[PDB]
Design a protein around this ligand. Sequence first.
Ligand SMILES: CC(C)=CCC/C(C)=C/COP(=O)(O)OP(=O)(O)O
Ligand SMILES: CC(C)=CCC/C(C)=C\COP(=O)(O)OP(=O)(O)O
Ligand SMILES: [Mg+2]
Ligand SMILES: [Mg+2]
Lengths: 284, 284
Amino acid sequence: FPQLPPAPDDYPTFPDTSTWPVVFPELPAAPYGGPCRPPQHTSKAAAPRIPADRLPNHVAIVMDGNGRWATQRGLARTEGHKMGEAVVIDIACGAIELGIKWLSLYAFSTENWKRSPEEVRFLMGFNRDVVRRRRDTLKKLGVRIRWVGSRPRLWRSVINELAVAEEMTKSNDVITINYCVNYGGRTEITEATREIAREVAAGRLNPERITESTIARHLQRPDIPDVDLFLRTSGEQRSSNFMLWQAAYAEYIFQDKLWPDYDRRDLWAACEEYASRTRRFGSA
Amino acid sequence: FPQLPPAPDDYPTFPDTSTWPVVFPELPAAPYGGPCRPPQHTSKAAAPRIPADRLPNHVAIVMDGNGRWATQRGLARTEGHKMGEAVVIDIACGAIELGIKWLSLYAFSTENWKRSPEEVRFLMGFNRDVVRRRRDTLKKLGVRIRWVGSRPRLWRSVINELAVAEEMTKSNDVITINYCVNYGGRTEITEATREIAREVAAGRLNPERITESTIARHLQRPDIPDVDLFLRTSGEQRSSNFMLWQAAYAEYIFQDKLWPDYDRRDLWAACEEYASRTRRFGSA
Ligand SMILES: CC(C)=CCC/C(C)=C/COP(=O)(O)OP(=O)(O)O
Ligand SMILES: CC(C)=CCC/C(C)=C\COP(=O)(O)OP(=O)(O)O
Ligand SMILES: [Mg+2]
Ligand SMILES: [Mg+2]
């Protein structure tokens, strides 16, 4: 509707935070078919009945509040980032249940190089490890995942683990996740402009025929549709250069809770809020 | 502090909406030097005291709610637009009293062509008329005003009035107002890329030396600073393609009030909220 019908009471749940990393549970097959039904949330709550025409096609999430969450508990920054991993997969599962087809996640920004070298080194190694550790699960779920971001300075290991994940999941179609690492909206537009410039220098493009579509086709990932719902947690009301081209007409929802406390029910609440919003795209 | 002191109690007030267009009051002579103090608000409220370093340098406003405002009163949508003129000038006045250096106003977007022919026709002539009617006053307040927008489809008469306003006020420095008509963020970025492409074709630019700053330098108005505070009235929570490149890192404040009900005290309220907040890591 296009939601998955409620899960059988006994269907496996997620996340069990009794251990870290959180062990993603074994799922029954349910053939003949392809993708496994994502695990139900711990609370066993069901996705709300949102009609196709009022559901966001593409949700972009700026995950925020990890450091504050850690500090509330006298913990190292790193421990809040670690708690955020389960939340990503939880939101993936909820996204699928609700029927969201595109999901962009701001895993690491071009501005995040301004953090301490210790934290940046953790975040790089952490993203590398998360993709390696979760990509098999994501594939089973019918998730198509791939890297979106800028090449310079990004660890080759992180690009390489995502390329592997991209190849493994290239024919999946339940949901697409743009895993944005070393991503910058201005930077992505700039890279598109560089490509365009090269074609002009090569005599292959008339400057006068450059249109908005020219820019869109030359973005790293030209198939990414416009952002309908732009979410950011921790109550910070800033887009921070995320999905800059794509989100020009996005609806913003700013939720107060810190990312490690976030779960799929909060995503669902944001989508209900989106459902009530009226979008005009400049029309009367 | 960069605020103007509270105005003399007997200093002219603005706006009186008992006439349309509203009458801009005669102001006492400057002995001199140049720029005259703006009329104070009808309420005689004074701008809040905010250190120059904690103000937003650049405030962008999406003026919204004119149509709903008219509809509440059983009036044609264009009657709401008419009321917006006074609010623009009142906010200009209030921005000067607060010490704001940069103000961008979204007067008509590249997507507003989707509206009815009668509303578009009105908005074009209305913007033309407002600039002609208010140009001399803005000049005497020390406002530097100029057009920001895309040329195709925009009435030449609107461009022409703003050209005269730009020339008359090019040496002013109290506040800069970007008067954005037929403005579209994606379209402005595209125009810059076309500019870059032309330079590349002429050999005056190396495509491998193109950076984010190359794009910035090729925007229509390259001197526009980053938007610090992005405001939108009417309860809508979206940027709608306004100051797209420039507002990458903006803080958003959404105010529920309809534009014709807005006044300079509301601008002050948002700026004080912006200013008083602790500027956390990852915010300039
Ligand atoms: C002062 C000036 C130049 C105003 C023009 C602003 C323009 C974009 C219309 C905003 O109201 P609206 O028409 O979008 O109102 P509503 O959303 O209620 O229909
Ligand atoms: C892989 C993971 C978990 C990514 C999370 C996103 C990351 C860039 C930091 C988000 O929180 P924060 O560090 O900015 O929190 P705070 O603002 O509270 O310090
Ligand atoms: Mg943060
Ligand atoms: Mg509107």
